[PDB]
Amino acid sequence: TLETAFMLPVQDAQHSFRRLLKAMSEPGVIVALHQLKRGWQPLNIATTSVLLTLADNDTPVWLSTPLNNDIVNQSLRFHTNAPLVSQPEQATFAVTDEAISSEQLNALSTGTAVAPEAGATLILQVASLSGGRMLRLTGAGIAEERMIAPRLPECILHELTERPHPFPLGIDLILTCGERLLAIPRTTHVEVC
Amino acid sequence: MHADTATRQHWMSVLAHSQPAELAARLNALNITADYEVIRAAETGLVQIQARMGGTGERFFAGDATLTRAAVRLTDGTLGYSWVQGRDKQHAERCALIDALMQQSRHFQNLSETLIAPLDADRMARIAARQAEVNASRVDFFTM
């Protein structure tokens, strides 16, 4: 028995997309993806909604082992037909929780200088979008400054503050928690307050 | 009588622009009766088209169109000619015949009134009718 997906796949994917578009284009804005009502545990509602909206046979998906079980796997295959890969370096969409390792993060595809779009998007399920270390965001999508305090593992925070890869290379980050979502593209300047 | 050049140009143009079936129908209803010989049997060839660069400039050749010419002679020696676009040989000979007849006092006023003017009116009405249809596709932007 598989998980169910969108009840109104056309309308619900469109709604989810517009919320994610808002988040990615105005980094640090938290949005809600309400249309799906049960997440594919341990995937939360937002994570599941993003995958149902963007993943298909053209987009390899890597689910870290804490988020990897046969019901989610079979359900993803059935509803989206996305290839499931077991290596992060092979993924178009990477999905992890807070236990992500430095080695997994660093294995993710970043794009190339000539084709910066050809890399991974990291979807990271966090314990909370508040109560973490306070950050200041600046850059494209931010009029002046935006402060956020997501619960982030140190190596993720390191990627954001140091940007080891020269722009236009880099992963874009989507933080999910429950039905809610926050995005930080590779352009955002991030500093710890 | 001796028709001035513009008068002859006009009746020749009306004939050349006439629909061959309508010219045939009209001329048959009038009774031809006049005798004539065909001195140049209808011949179809080409007229080479000259156009102008930018509409107004140097000439250049822009292909060819079909052209049919014919010539007749009436009993009194009157010569009638036609040059008509297309390939309708009977039509060209009819046009040439009428050109000869129009030069005679016996026929000029009669045919002007009963043949040429009606043909011209019909063509003008067809042009008007088409322009009325085409003008429905004008894009309106501003008023008064």
């Binding site: 309308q11 994917a13 808002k22 963007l54 190339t112 000539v114 779009e117 494209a140 236009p168 | 894009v139």
Partner: protein, 277 residues
């Protein structure tokens, strides 16, 4: 609503999904031309298929759609595109800029400032700002990779040398977020300043050339120029003849076989609202 027998917004869901992924990459890489597997539409290539595919992938049943071409809603191709979407989505439409949620445009940014959550979608013929310097994509993609944009400065000064002025008057190149040089679509240079730190999202679609790009809200957009030859915009000796505005981009309407003309607002929504007071 949609009673057409086609899928909502005509595109199938796979095509929308691929476009949505491309939009999200474009947003994260501002000004970079993202290639996408665009498909043939019921409009010919060159007549706005990129914009159509973006709008179709973005729009939802509750959006309010405005479609303009040359600044006017009633332009032939705007009518054609707006009616297509009415047929295949049943979405509410508007002519009022400040009532729209999605604006699809060919060659104008409205005079009315855009606001948060508005999306403006530009039709783009040539997405590569370098293309009339270097016609080969095999070459221009590497120039972008390496941020090799000097040839554009050269082109500009060569105008100045030859004519005394920069000769690019529309589709005037801009630097986005301090990095990529981007073609803003064939808007007049007059509209370029509106792109800088705008509250709305800007998307750009080139259907024939198979590129999508974007400028997020509140992003620096700086027209290329020099200190001794700073950016200028179109001007006219006349105000709009209908509403009197001196602040709008004007259309030259030729009235007489000989000489007489009238200058009126290109942005027809703006013009009527000016006229109303």
């Amino acid at each position: 609503a949609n009673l057409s027998g086609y899928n909502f917004a005509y595109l199938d869901e796979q095509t929308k999904r691929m476009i949505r992924r491309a939009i999200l990459k474009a947003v994260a890489i501002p000004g970079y031309q993202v290639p996408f597997g665009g498909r043939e539409m019921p409009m010919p290539y060159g007549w706005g298929t990129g914009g159509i595919q973006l709008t179709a992938s973005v729009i939802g049943e509750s959006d309010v759609l405005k479609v303009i071409d040359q600044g006017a809603d009633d332009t032939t191709n705007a009518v054609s595109i707006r009616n297509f979407f009415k047929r295949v989505t049943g979405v509410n439409t508007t002519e009022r800029t400040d009532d729209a949620t999605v604006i699809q445009t060919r060659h104008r940014i409205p005079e009315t400032p855009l606001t948060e959550d508005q999306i403006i979608i530009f039709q783009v013929p040539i997405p590569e700002p370098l293309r009339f310097i270097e016609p080969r994509e095999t070459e221009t993609r590497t120039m972008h990779a390496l941020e090799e944009y000097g040839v554009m400065q050269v082109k500009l000064y060569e105008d100045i040398a030859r004519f005394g002025h920069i000769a690019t008057t529309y589709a005037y190149p801009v630097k986005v977020n301090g990095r990529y040089v981007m073609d803003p679509s064939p808007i007049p240079k007059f509209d370029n300043p509106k792109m800088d730190m705008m509250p709305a999202l800007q998307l750009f679609g080139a259907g024939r050339e198979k590129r999508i790009y974007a400028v997020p809200p509140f992003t620096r957009v700086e027209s290329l120029d020099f200190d001794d030859h700073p950016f200028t915009v179109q001007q006219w000796d006349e105000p709009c003849a209908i509403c009197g505005s001196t602040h709008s981009y004007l259309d030259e309407v030729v009235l007489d076989d000989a000489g007489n003309r009238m200058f009126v607002c290109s942005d027809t929504d703006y013009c009527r609202q000016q006229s109303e007071a």
